[PDB]
Amino acid sequence: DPETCLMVFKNHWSQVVRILERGADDLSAVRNHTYQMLTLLAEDRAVPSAPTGPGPLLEFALHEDLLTRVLTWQLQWDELGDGVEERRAEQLKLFEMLVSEARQPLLRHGPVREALLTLLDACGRPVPSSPALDEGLVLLLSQLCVCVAQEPSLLEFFLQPPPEPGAAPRLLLFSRLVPFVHLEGTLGQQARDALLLLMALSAGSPTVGRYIADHSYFCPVLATGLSALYSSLPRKIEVPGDDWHCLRREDWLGVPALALFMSSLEFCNAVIQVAHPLVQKQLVDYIHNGFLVPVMGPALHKTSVEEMIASTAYLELFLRSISEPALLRTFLRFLLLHRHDTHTILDTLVARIGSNSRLCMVSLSLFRTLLNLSCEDVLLQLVLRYLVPCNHVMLSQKPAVRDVDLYGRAADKFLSLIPRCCRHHAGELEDNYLEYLREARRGVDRCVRACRTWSAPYDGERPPSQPFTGPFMAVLFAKLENMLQNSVYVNFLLTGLVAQLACHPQPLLRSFLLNTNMVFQPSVKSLLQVLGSVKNKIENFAASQEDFPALLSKAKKYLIARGKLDRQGEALRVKNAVYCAVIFPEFLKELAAISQAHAVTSPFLL
Amino acid sequence: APEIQALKNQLQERDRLFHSLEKEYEKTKSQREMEEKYIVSAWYNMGMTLHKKAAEDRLASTGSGQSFLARQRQATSSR
Amino acid sequence: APEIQALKNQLQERDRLFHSLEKEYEKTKSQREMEEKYIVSAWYNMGMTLHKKAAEDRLASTG
Amino acid sequence: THASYGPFYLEYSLLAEFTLVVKQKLPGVYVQPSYRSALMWFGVIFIRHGLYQDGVFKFTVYIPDNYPDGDCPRLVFDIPVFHPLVDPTSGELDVKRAFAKWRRNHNHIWQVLMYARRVFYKIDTASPLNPEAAVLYEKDIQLFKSKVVDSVKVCTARLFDQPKIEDPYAISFSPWNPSVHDEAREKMLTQKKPEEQHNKSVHVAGLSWVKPGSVQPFSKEE
């Protein structure tokens, strides 16, 4: 019964106050008396007449501030040094038992909050530290985070005022979780969840958010963590396959150094998703100015080829893993506006498309991810900035930008360029034009729904001396003109980019690529002129090579079977160009079907 | 009375135009109501025939593999 | 003058229900004009969906 | 090479033509292409005022097999309307007088539908197809209006039947039963624009940070 607990509680507490008013024996006596009193306090019940009020044991304890005075009586014994990390763990276990086990919400009271705040200062002594003490500290902080997450009004009550005018306040619930974010295992994960809960509570409070964004060093800790973890990554990608173009799930989990970076970036992504806007802007600016500019700025410009491949693959993985638009704005502004050796970073990445190796494949995958983000600014800076002034068209054909290929002139013009060697003489590649029409329908519909938030339609009205279509168009067409010399996996991503770019519903971009009846100024190279040059070169290889119809049959039957299993210079040139004769007519089917589906899209989308 | 007959004449012409706009508004509302009833009935029969054809459409909608190039690009990541 | 007052009362009531009829005509016209866009779009969206479905079915059948 | 993809070209041309029919606004004209044939467009006009008021005329648009390099599309009615330009035994409207030559990229099928609506709002008697309708037009107008009212009742009485051309996409009315048709009407009216559409799954999210009217990136104010 609850009254007998009161008598035996004043029995132990009377022994304890006597011990304070009069060393190892007294310390052991107050430790087991403390254990008994706090286990009895964990099993207090409220009075049934007033269950919303505190119980009688809390009424006796909080009246004279029992917990804080016995805690500071042990902390003045802490200066001896005998059993410091055992006694600290003992009080950690005791106050964790009050936070978890007690059926009343104890934290609404002042004195127990002050006792917990003094205990958090007692555990704030500097390193070295036994791992049991860190485990108990993280567990106590996590349980306190859970309790304050259930009662959100006490985050300002834990924000205790500065001890000096102009000094920083001491939120001991948050600042003690700051060194434990980078730790691995269960302990660092518990610290990350507890800090995420605190940041969710600080989303609804302007005083705590201004404290974290202005009087706490959490954002430099995160920025220096990302900067230090971008030194432990390998500068060499050791993957044996030649079809590898980007870091897969099996790849970045296979490198333990990269997994720590990926977990840290996921934590930063969640913090940017959740926390307060002042805190969000502080972490945005600190992540930018302390990770991207000082580290990733020089790291992309590493001259050696394999370091370039590694940096481009890491950049593509990071752009593929941000979900929040605020951190994505940071990454994309860093890519689009930061200038090194008087050149844009995006210009440097454009210049790496025209390369002869795995660097080209990772660059095409990076630009595939960039165009798959469906952002305005990348597509604008790549092509549309050069297509807004509309100088590539002569003076009398400027209305032809807005025309729509209703009757299939463009599909006929593209399908007329299919080579005579590849045409079926009087094997699933003979009549699959319906399947290209389906994926052109989902291709245009995806690029229409993802452009609904865009500022301008780019229809030619809203908004060198000879016209120039931009360094992205010149490099992409010149690499497309070399389609015989390129690899089969390079051509797969290169035709993947042009098909994905032609699905954009912008009439300035669509008329430049798919409107075949457009004639341009002589300095401008169209997509039709480039594909015509490939058509001439693939037929010249046809007449000069003897074994070609037998080589077409075996190279085709491999390419279906890859979808089902889901002296060197002459041998390489033969192998690439025979592969090019399987891609090019069905690249021609893909560009035809996209130009068909642009005349079909509903008014009830845009 | 010569003033009275002219004033009641323009009063009766006012009533004449009132009756003309009355019957015109009645005809307009009746046609719009019947037209909307016809449209909703046609769409409802249309949709019920679509759910009757859904017994075939639940088998016809099955299909995968996409285009050859998209399947090949997605199969490039399989080592 | 009493007859003139009577027919002017009847006349003012005639233009009063003229304004009432014109207000009801304009409100019904604007309601039907707003309603026409929604009924036409709800017809033609499903109509274009059925046209695309029959379109791909025919284009699949001819090969 | 060209002959292998001709059905694709013609058939997607007719698909784009129905899309551009949806583009242009038509008062009371509700057009639908057929299921079984690609060259048949069913439909129905509602004549909102004029002499043919409260008239409901079903039709069927016949598209030539070589569109657009061919003739004007042929338009017939389900029931022959007593009109000077409607065939009294077949129901074919004389569409070819206005569209004498089908010029490529100029004429479209929505212009045929617009002329079909406009022929009931401007009666022309020059060189007809039903001569008694013409000579009732410029001589004895009240008998013409009586015969218009009678033909409107004849057309209205045959609306609810099994239609002339059997098709899974044939326009078939039902008698007004409010218990399910009110659910159908609210299923009309609860639909809205694709802004905030019911597809809230699958994060198809675009990004933009340019101030409108400007061409420089990252000019949108924070």
Author numbering:
A (entry chain C): 32 to 53, 62 to 465, 545 to 581, 733 to 835, 914 to 953
B (entry chain A): 627 to 705
C (entry chain B): 627 to 689
D (entry chain D): 66 to 287
Passage from the reporting paper:
Cellular cargos move bidirectionally on microtubules by recruiting opposite polarity motors dynein and kinesin. Here we show that kinesin-3 KIF1C acts as both an activator and a processivity factor for dynein, using in vitro reconstitutions of human proteins. Unlike other cargo adapters, HOOKs form a stable assembly with two other accessory factors, FTS and FHIP. We provide a structural model for the autoinhibited FTS–HOOK3–FHIP1B (an FHF complex) and explain how KIF1C relieves it.
Our 3.2 Å reconstruction of full-length FTS and FHIP1B in complex with a C-terminal HOOK3 fragment (residues 571–718) allowed an atomic model to be built for each subunit. In the absence of HOOK3 the complex between FTS and FHIP1B does not form, suggesting that HOOK3 is central to FHF assembly. Our structure reveals HOOK3’s interactions involve the last of its four coiled-coil domains (CC4) and a C-terminal extension (CTE), consisting of a flexible region followed by a single alpha helix (residues 694–702). The first contact point (site 1) involves one of HOOK3’s two CTEs, with the helix latching onto a hydrophobic pocket within FHIP1B. Site 2 comprises a span of HOOK3 CC4 residues (653–688), packing tightly against the catalytically dead E2 ubiquitin ligase domain in FTS. At site 3, the opposite side of HOOK3 CC4 (spanning residues 663–670) binds a C-terminal alpha helix on FTS. This helix is situated within a long loop (FTS ‘belt’) that wraps around HOOK3 before docking into at the midzone of FHIP1B. Instead, the opposing face of FHIP1B comprises a highly conserved patch of surface-exposed residues. AlphaFold2 (AF) suggests this is a binding site for small G-protein Rab5, which has been shown to link FHF to early endosomes.
